[PDB]
Amino acid sequence: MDQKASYFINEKLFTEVKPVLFTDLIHHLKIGPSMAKKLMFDYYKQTTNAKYNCVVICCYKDQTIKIIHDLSNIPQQDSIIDCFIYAFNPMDSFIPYYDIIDQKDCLTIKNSYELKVS
Amino acid sequence: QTLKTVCRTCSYRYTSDAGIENDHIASKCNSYDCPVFYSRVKAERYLRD
Amino acid sequence: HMDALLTKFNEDRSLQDENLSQPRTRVRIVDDNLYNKSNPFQLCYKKRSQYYHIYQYRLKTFRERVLKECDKRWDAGFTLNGQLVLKKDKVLDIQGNQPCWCVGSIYCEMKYKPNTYGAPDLTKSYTDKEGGSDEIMLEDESGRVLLVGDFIRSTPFITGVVVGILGMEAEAGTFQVLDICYPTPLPQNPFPAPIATCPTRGKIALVSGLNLNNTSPDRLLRLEILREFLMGRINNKIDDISLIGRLLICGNSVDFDIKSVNKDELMISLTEFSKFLHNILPSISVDIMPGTNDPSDKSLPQQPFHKSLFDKSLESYFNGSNKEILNLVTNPYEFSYNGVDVLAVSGKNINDICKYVIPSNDNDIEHRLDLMECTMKWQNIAPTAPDTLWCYPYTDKDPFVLDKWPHVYIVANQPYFGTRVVEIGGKNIKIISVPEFSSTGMIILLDLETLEAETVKID
Amino acid sequence: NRWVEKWLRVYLKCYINLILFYRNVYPPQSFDYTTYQSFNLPQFVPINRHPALIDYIEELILDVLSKLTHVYRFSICIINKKNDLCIEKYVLDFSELQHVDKDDQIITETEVFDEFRSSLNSLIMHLEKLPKVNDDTITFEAVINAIELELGHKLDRNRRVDSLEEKAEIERDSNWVKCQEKIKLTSLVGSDVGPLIIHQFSEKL
Numbered sequence: 061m062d063q064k065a066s067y068f069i070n071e072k073l074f075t076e077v078k079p080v081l082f083t084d085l086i087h088h089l090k091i092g093p094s095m096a097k098k099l100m101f102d103y104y105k106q107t108t109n110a111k112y113n114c115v116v117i118c119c120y121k122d123q124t125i126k127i128i129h130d131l132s133n134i135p136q137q138d139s140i141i142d143c144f145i146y147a148f149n150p151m152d153s154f155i156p157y158y159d160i161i162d163q164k165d166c167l168t169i170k171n172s173y174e175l176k177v178s
Numbered sequence: 179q180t181l182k183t184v185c186r187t188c189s190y191r192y193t194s195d196a197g198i199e200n201d202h203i204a205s206k207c208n209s210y211d212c213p214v215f216y217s218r219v220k221a222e223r224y225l226r227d
Numbered sequence: 228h229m230d231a232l233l234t235k236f237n238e239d240r241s242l243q244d245e246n247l248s249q250p251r252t253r254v255r256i257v258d259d260n261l262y263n264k265s266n267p268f269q270l271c272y273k274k275r276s277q278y279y280h281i282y283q284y285r286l287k288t289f290r291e292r293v294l295k296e297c298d299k300r301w302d303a304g305f306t307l308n309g310q311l312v313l314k315k316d317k318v319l320d321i322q323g324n325q326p327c328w329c330v331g332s333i334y335c336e337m338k339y340k341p342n343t344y345g346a347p348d349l350t351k352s353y354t355d356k357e358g359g360s361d362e363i364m365l366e367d368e369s370g371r372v373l374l375v376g377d378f379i380r381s382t383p384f385i386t387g388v389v390v391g392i393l394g395m396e397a398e399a400g401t402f403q404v405l406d407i408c409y410p411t412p413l414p415q416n417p418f419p420a421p422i423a424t425c426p427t428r429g430k431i432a433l434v435s436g437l438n439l440n441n442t443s444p445d446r447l448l449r450l451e452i453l454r455e456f457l458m459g460r461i462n463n464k465i466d467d468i469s470l471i472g473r474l475l476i477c478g479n480s481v482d483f484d485i486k487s488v489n490k491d492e493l494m495i496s497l498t499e500f501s502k503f504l505h506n507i508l509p510s511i512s513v514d515i516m517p518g519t520n521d522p523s524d525k526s527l528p529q530q531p532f533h534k535s536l537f538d539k540s541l542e543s544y545f546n547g548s549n550k551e552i553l554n555l556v557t558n559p560y561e562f563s564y565n566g567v568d569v570l571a572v573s574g575k576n577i578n579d580i581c582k583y584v585i586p587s588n589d590n591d592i593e594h595r596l597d598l599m600e601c602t603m604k605w606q607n608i609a610p611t612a613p614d615t616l617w618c619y620p621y622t623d624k625d626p627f628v629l630d631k632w633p634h635v636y637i638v639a640n641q642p643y644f645g646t647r648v649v650e651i652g653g654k655n656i657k658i659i660s661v662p663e664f665s666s667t668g669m670i671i672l673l674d675l676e677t678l679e680a681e682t683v684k685i686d
Numbered sequence: 687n688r689w690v691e692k693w694l695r696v697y698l699k700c701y702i703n704l705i706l707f708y709r710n711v712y713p714p715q716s717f718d719y720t721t722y723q724s725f726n727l728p729q730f731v732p733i734n735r736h737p738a739l740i741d742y743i744e745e746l747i748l749d750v751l752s753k754l755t756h757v758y759r760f761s762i763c764i765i766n767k768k769n770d771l772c773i774e775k776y777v778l779d780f781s782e783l784q785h786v787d788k789d790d791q792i793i794t795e796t797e798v799f800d801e802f803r804s805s806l807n808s809l810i811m812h813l814e815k816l817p818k819v820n821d822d823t824i825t826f827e828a829v830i831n832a833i834e835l836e837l838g839h840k841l842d843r844n845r846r847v848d849s850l851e852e853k854a855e856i857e858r859d860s861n862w863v864k865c866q867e868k869i870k871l872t873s874l875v876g877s878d879v880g881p882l883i884i885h886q887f888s889e890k891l
């Protein structure tokens with residue numbers, strides 16, 4: 061019932077139109093990447109008049125990791141396990157801009173040598 | 179490095195096909211009149227700084 | 228679509244059974260290389276025409292080096308019906324009909340297929356036909372001899388290659404090629420296994436350089452969108468994070484061309500590199516090296532440029548953490564994991580040989596894979612402008628392609644992926660050719676569990 | 687100030703040349719997505735290099751920024767070769783500017799670039815969502831709906847000119863002509879950063 065995420069995605073999609081790639085979701089919720097996949101699926105499931113669809117990355121790998129642009133086709137990933145949905149885009153192309161984000165809360169896997177101020 | 183490339187392609191006529199000893203013979207070319215040589219002279223004037 | 232249905236099917240990983248405010252730290256990385264040695268390839272702090280003295284220094288250093296091995300590590304003179312294999316290098320007594328060990332260096336054909344104050348193309352007429360002929364000349368600095376045989380084209384000893392040749396003499400001018408020599412092995416730096424409580428150690432040689440012109444978004448694509456999240460958020464559920472170690476770029480930090488660039492477009496791509504590296508630095512620690520088209524000396528010993536690759540947000544981390552999370556390292560570096568020594572090359576050192584300066588020695592990934600095998604074996608002068616320093620180029624301690632041998636050499640920016648392993652009498656060496664990122668990436672795990680490499684197609 | 691009209695110059699470069707790209711007034715193979723045309727762009731904007739044309743574009747932007755308080759609304763007009771009738775009129779604004787106030791505060795570089803990236807991406811969105819029929823035979827011309835201007839008489843009155851800056855200024859007043867003064871109008875999301883209020887819309891026919 062986590063619609064607390066969904067309206068926050070709704071401003072960034074709509075009231076201004078900069079796309080979320082991943083990092084806004086992890087900044088907002090600090091949910092798991094599997095849970096972020098569930099959330100983006102839920103947004104896709106509860107889509108009402110998306111201006112344009114997202115394209116997914118595919119979890120099934122076979123020594124390949126490809127953003128799908130042959131959406132109907134199955135590009136070398138035939139016996140598919142799963143997909144991780146992200147990069148919901150208003151535009152023709154999928155480009156975000158990239159920025160420093162808060163990560164001390166958000167880092168899923170920390171550094172083998174943690175940084176020291178010294 | 180472009181001047182050194184020009185100089186070794188100029189100095190290829192004195193080697194048979196070798197390219198690794200081309201650098202010293204390129205550096206020791208001294209014309210009073212060559213349109214890349216003086217630019218290499220001031221290039222090597224810069225690298226001492 | 229049914230792609231969403233696959234997510235609907237896979238409800239088993241609700242949250243991957245991670246706490247997710249617990250970071251599970253993966254690697255106990257040792258990195259013995261960082262502090263308690265001088266790096267030979269690195270600059271001189273006091274330091275902070277050249278090439279000529281270096282060439283004789285390589286020739287003499289190899290001459291005493293392989294002078295120890297013509298009969299110690301090769302053919303006994305009791306064979307060949309007592310044909311004398313005594314250590315005469317000059318061609319004055321090579322004309323004696325007994326074949327000796329001809330300890331000399333091949334400079335047969337090295338000039339440029341692609342290109343006018345010096346009138347180059349008129350000179351290059353001599354280049355094309357003679358260079359196309361694959362004939363090999365051996366120079367000990369005392370005279371050329373002809374070479375024919377099968378290993379003329381199969382074994383790519385193109386330039387700077389001190390060998391001892393064995394053939395039935397049969398003419399003063401020419402030999403066949405039955406045998407070559409090598410430098411002696413500088414010895415086995417011990418490969419460890421931490422057998423008690425094995426870490427399942429990190430396994431990484433990922434990035435060949437994120438080649439990033441501002442002029443193209445497609446090179447900007449496949450960084451920061453698939454990567455920085457394969458290290459941490461894009462998941463193989465969950466083993467990809469367990470294999471991945473500490474981030475290794477090799478050269479090519481920002482692609483640009485020098486005659487078209489100015490101040491602010493250099494900082495645009497360098498601050499977006501800062502965005503990438505400060506994005507991935509909480510997740511995975513990084514080791515960075517410039518050297519071919521990112522700013523450099525354009526030499527193999529090349530001073531790595533600190534404080535320019537980073538914005539003010541990221542600038543204070545190298546001040547805060549000295550060499551742990553990131554340090555500036557050169558085009559060669561000996562990354563040692565308590566004796567798993569591995570060597571890096573940004574690629575230009577072999578890519579100029581593989582495409583730019585090659586008219587001969589050609590019988591194309593399986594050809595170019597073995598050029599850096601050769602450059603590993605002889606530890607020799609590959610490129611055309613080496614060591615390229617106004618002060619202290621080489622002080623008889625630090626060859627640009629060094630003398631201490633690694634367990635893996637990294638070379639970069641090839642057309643295709645290539646990863647074999649070959650065993651030599653000294654050690655075992657795995658061949659790593661990580662492709663340039665616009666040529667489909669083919670991004671690689673490296674080593675250190677059973678000395679095994681794993682590429683993944685990033686396209 | 688000084689930095690704020692640099693931002694206005696980059697924003698108008700992105701706006702103008704992006705309208706030029708999505709109307710196919712120049713061939714798309716000359717365009718490539720980039721961040722550097724003399725400055726730092728917020729987004730990857732498809733820019734053809736063509737140094738006469740980019741000279742024209744930065745010329746026009748340096749013309750519009752030269753007045754900087756008469757203009758309440760910069761705009762882009764779209765004219766066919768077939769008729770002089772307006773095909774689209776893309777709206778932009780110079781309302782409540784920092785530069786007229788000359789307030790030092792506030793820089794907010796990432797925040798102003800954020801709202802600029804939003805307004806650019808909105809321009810992308812409502813430039814693909816109208817279709818592509820008759821994709822060639824379109825041209826470009828500028829229009830400014832401004833509140834209080836007339837500068838074109840400065841060529842006259844027997845003036846004697848000595849400095850290159852006012853040579854440029856006479857070129858600014860020379861290049862601009864008042865014209866003689868609806869069918870559809872579509873919404874566009876503008877930037878709503880504090881000092882730079884750019885309330886940008888679109889018009890159709």
Ligand code: SF4
Pocket residue numbers: 184185186188189204207208209212213214215344345
């Ligand atoms: S400087 Fe000397 S070697 Fe170089 S191009 Fe001129 S004449 Fe030839």
